[PDB]
């Protein structure tokens, strides 16, 4: 798995415009092999719209590096957060729909996302 494909497994869902039930994060955190991962975001936009962020607004990454990029547009995202009834073998998540700007770190000679940093 390249860093780009890890980013797509861990955060992309082009197959929906927005989380489809209060169980979306229970169905997807297990399904993309993240179960617990306390917090995670899926982005409901096409792969090309997410790759286009790597040539938009350059900002600092949380890890101190400086190749992160924040979307000019708000995007549909699902925020997945551990409830208070969730210890790992059975991991329960609160599904929350949001429209937000995203920040990703970008790499490669196809210059593409390899890390989801934040949303704002």
């Amino acid at each position, epitope marked *: 798995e390249t860093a780009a494909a890890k980013f797509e497994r861990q955060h992309m869902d082009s197959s929906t415009s927005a989380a489809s039930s209060s169980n979306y994060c229970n169905q997807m955190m297990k399904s993309r092999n993240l179960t617990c991962k306390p917090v995670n975001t899926f982005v409901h936009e096409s792969l090309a719209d997410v790759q286009a962020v790597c040539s938009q607004k350059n900002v600092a990454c949380k890890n101190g590096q400086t190749n992160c990029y924040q979307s000019y547009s708000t995007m549909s995202i699902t925020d997945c957060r551990e409830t208070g009834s969730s210890k790992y073998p059975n991991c329960a998540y609160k599904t929350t729909q949001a429209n937000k700007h995203i920040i990703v770190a970008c*790499e490669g000679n196809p210059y593409v996302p390899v890390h989801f940093d934040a949303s704002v």
Partner: nanobody
Amino acid sequence: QVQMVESGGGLVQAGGSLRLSCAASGYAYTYIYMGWFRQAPGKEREGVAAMDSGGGGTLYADSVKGRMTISRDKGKNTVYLQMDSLKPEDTATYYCAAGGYELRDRTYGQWGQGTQVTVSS
């Protein structure tokens, strides 16, 4: 589209000086890192110098330390390479690059097309 504009390459005698200029044209914010890379035939692309948009974060490959100065206009998408005491081993294509981190070229996404620098003997 952002366009990397990039001038100053050419042909000088050993010990001579050149100055490379570069601007990211059409970008409305300020790229945090901009730096310079080079590549001789059949050889790895290697980092030469990088600098952040505040004048800080400066970095140099050891083979050019003492002989090339990078500089930028603070808060702007320009970067310059002043090359002094050039050697035959400095003969290479030199590329402008913007928007990445230090001399980690995989982190850079905007690249200029490169100008020849040749140093005769």
